[PDB]
Design a protein around this ligand. Structure first.
Ligand code: CA
Ligand code: CA
Ligand code: NA
Ligand code: NA
Ligand code: ZN
Ligand code: ZN
Lengths: 65, 234, 240, 66
């Protein structure tokens, strides 16, 4: 049980951020992610374990101006 | 400061957080604004009105009709003229008492480095990642704070990055049309952050602020430095 | 619209939310901006750039040097000239293809009612409670959406109030007719007025968005909060 | 019991109305609006609106400038 993009959904314990994004089929290019309102650097996704109650955000970079 | 500056800046001098010493600090400062489009034009207008001593305006594009929907510093008679020159001219009419320097070019390499060196704060108002990564690299290397924002469609993003880069840099975070007031709100907020940083007003930095202009909501996320960052990781 | 309009509004037209249909509705709309100060000047600039077909600009002041720190539409060359006239002239330079109407007056009574009736939406960009209450009373009586904002120091307040007034009106929130002229940071009042333009474009083009929400900005802490408005049973304006 | 008042934790008696609480805190009502749990509570209701344990309250002043 976590919040993904402000919406509840069920997951699987002991899974990495990478594992989760892979199952959801989400593009990770041009994407950044936060857990409990703090950015999780991309280089840490392979190892970072998602915890129960985690509030996750996955969004795209905007470069326009 | 002289009588003319006192009257001109009176409405912010009345604020105890800025006052006479804070205004003098703005007058002694130098801001580099890279990109004079949707983000840069409102930012330059507010910074010139606020009394930033010297504004360096960098852009190598000419004014085009389709620009007018969001680049509020320009007019139909400016079409086909160089943006940095038109900006310099219009901003002078708003405030003829500060220094306005126009750079008609794509600031890169050595030239980018000398301009970031001379600036007290840099505003990244460009429109593509390669350029934003190059400006971020120059700011960290030259230890100069960077205020970066972006917008597309109804969305905007903004972050204030400052030495000692405790929350990382642009590269730690990032390894159709646009509605005029959405990019405009982002550029104006860049100006607000610069005024606070130059006048010494305590405020947060190191946070990514996201704006959804359609749901009309904002969210703040704490940035985090990436240990492997080729720019600010050591 | 014609070919020149197509090019001019192209970056807005590319958005599927606005597109050719939404642009035509902006072009067919009328907006009344009351107050050509820190809130009103950026709102008018963006609304003009957006292609709102008719903008009515009402203000009773002349440009003063101390205005320039936040009223970005004006220049040193305009000092001592009437604000609505200068605004109409500068805005036609930006966009000579829309209707720009200047009202150099403090809109009240019958003149206010007539301008509110003709507008599709009203932007309250004024600077005192009494006038704001008068505008709110006219908008509710004439069933015209009202987008209101204010700013002082580093703070800002904004609300979008639309018929049937499910969340009340300005008077449901503020019963006061007077507070109980200070400093202000240029970009803070500027962001509130630019946000007023944004709400206007969404309302006029038919973009689903919230209304009846009070949005508060602290420019120092850099935080926003949204509060749900609530009608007051005994409101003398929308109380029915 | 315990409430949040303008984002700060504070203790106050149970069974109090908004009016009594504002009176206790010596706050002026003219020019002020109040939200509880993110919803405005019209001033006309403050004399009877009971403040509840865990309420998050904001008391702020109107800004009329522009
Ligand atoms: Ca470092
Ligand atoms: Ca499209
Ligand atoms: Na520097
Ligand atoms: Na009307
Ligand atoms: Zn970095
Ligand atoms: Zn009411």
């Amino acid at each position: 049980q976590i919040l993904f993009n402000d919406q509840a959904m069920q997951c699987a314990a002991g899974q990495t951020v990478h594992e989760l994004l892979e199952q959801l089929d989400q593009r990770q290019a041009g994407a950044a992610l936060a857990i409990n309102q703090q950015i999780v650097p991309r280089e840490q996704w392979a190892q970072h374990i998602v915890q129960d109650g985690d509030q996750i955000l996955l969004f795209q970079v905007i470069a326009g101006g | 400061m002289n009588d003319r500056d006192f009257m001109r800046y009176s409405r912010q001098i009345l604020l105890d957080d800025i006052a006479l010493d804070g205004q003098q600090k703005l007058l002694d400062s130098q801001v580099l604004i890279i990109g004079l489009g949707g983000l840069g034009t409102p930012a330059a207008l507010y910074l010139a009105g606020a009394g930033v001593g010297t504004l360096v305006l960098a852009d190598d594009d000419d004014v085009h009709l389709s620009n007018l929907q969001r680049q509020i510093l320009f007019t139909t008679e400016d079409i086909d003229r160089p943006k940095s020159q038109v900006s310099q001219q219009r901003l002078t009419q708003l405030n003829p008492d500060i220094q306005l320097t126009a750079l008609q070019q794509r600031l890169t390499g050595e030239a980018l480095k000398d301009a970031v060196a001379r600036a007290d704060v840099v505003l990244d108002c460009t429109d593509n990642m390669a350029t934003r990564q190059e400006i971020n690299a120059a700011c960290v290397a030259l230890n100069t704070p960077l205020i970066t924002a972006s917008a597309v469609g109804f969305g905007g993003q903004l972050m204030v990055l400052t030495p000692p880069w405790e929350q990382g840099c642009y590269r730690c975070l990032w390894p159709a049309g646009v509605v005029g007031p959405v990019v405009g709100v982002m550029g104006t907020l860049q100006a607000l952050e610069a005024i606070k940083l130059l006048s010494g007003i305590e405020t947060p930095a190191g946070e990514l602020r996201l704006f959804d202009g359609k749901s009309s909501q904002w969210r703040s996320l704490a940035l985090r430095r990436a240990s492997g960052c080729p720019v600010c990781g050591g």
